[PDB]
Amino acid sequence: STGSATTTPIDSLDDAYITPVQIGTPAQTLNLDFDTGSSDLWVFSSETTASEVDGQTIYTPSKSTTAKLLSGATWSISYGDGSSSSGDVYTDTVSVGGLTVTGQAVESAKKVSSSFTEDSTIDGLLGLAFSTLNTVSPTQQKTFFDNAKASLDSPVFTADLGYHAPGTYNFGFIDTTAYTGSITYTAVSTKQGFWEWTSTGYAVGSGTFKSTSIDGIADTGTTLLYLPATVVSAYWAQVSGAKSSSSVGGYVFPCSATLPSFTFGVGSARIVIPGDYIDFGPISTGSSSCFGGIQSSAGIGINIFGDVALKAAFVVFNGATTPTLGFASK
Numbered sequence: 001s002t003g004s005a006t007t008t009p010i011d012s013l014d015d016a017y018i019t020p021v022q023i024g025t026p027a028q029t030l031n032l033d034f035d036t037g038s039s040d041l042w043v044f045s046s047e048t049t050a051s052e053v054d055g056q057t058i059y060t061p062s063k064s065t066t067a068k069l070l071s072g073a074t075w076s077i078s079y080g081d082g083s084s085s086s087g088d089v090y091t092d093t094v095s096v097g098g099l100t101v102t103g104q105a106v107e108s109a110k111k112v113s114s115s116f117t118e119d120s121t122i123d124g125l126l127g128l129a130f131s132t133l134n135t136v137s138p139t140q141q142k143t144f145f146d147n148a149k150a151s152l153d154s155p156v157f158t159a160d161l162g163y164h165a166p167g168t169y170n171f172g173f174i175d176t177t178a179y180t181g182s183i184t185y186t187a188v189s190t191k192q193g194f195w196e197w198t199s200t201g202y203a204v205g206s207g208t209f210k211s212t213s214i215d216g217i218a219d220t221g222t223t224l225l226y227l228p229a230t231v232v233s234a235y236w237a238q239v240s241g242a243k244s245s246s247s248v249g250g251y252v253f254p255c256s257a258t259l260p261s262f263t264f265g266v267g268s269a270r271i272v273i274p275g276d277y278i279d280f281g282p283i284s285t286g287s288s289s290c291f292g293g294i295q296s297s298a299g300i301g302i303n304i305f306g307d308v309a310l311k312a313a314f315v316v317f318n319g320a321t322t323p324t325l326g327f328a329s330k
Helices: 144-151 229-236
Strands: 003-009 017-023 028-035 041-043 068-078 084-096 099-112 124-127 156-160 167-171 184-187 196-204 210-218 225-227 243-245 250-254 262-266 269-273 279-282 289-292 294-296 303-305 314-318 324-328
Touching (some): 028 041, 041 084, 068 099, 184 196, 229 294
Parallel strands (some): 041 099
Antiparallel strands (some): 003 167, 068 084, 156 314, 225 303, 250 289
């Protein structure tokens, strides 16, 4: 089997992407944030504290003839941005782009933190990291991809995120029309539960490539590109007036600037992020200070190849017995 679904930016900055997902019988369609940096499929629901729902579409398990309470199971998750959610668990039928999994754990939120409530466009998350990170207790649950893998034509999914435009998540096949050149594959460590790999270096604009190993994660659920402070300083030093602002929380730059591109290495191959992809717009409405798309990871503990980086490539998440990542230009 295969599946193919369109993923759409939630706003004019590409802050996140939502993909329609069918849950239950008859189908209830929710728009979920596919997140290769976490491993829980959780939704706003009829159980969510009413004051914490503000415009989202909810899953109502009592209206699904295929829903079953997973007795005793609870979940609770906290993300790198400080947001969180928790609740109980049902199993139900879940379909993405024509690909159906029966018995998928659907984690029903009883509580969500303010940033989730405040974002009316995201009805939940669909985790695509390794199932060892799933938070369900006392019996850990598998991701949608893990449950689907054996049925897929090939044990892979691909992320093709657009710049200010829709893109595609495919399951079970590699669309050879969706990229240019060849796909370069690189080793993955699953020891932390992430799609963790080592970039071979970077360049700023037309500058020379610096060969240096940068360990990080391919994370569709993080907006920006977080890299070591040395790399990020080298980038922003090429932008007149750019500076790190402790009050804003990162590098800002004059909105009048034209930004240089940023290249990262994948083996001997190179992925170029155009300068425009690094512009996240005014820090507050009407400001002439703009927020940068490349930021320091120094306070995180891990480097993160988020959407800013991933949207410049066609990315293969290869879930073969030994997982690997593939990157192609497009």
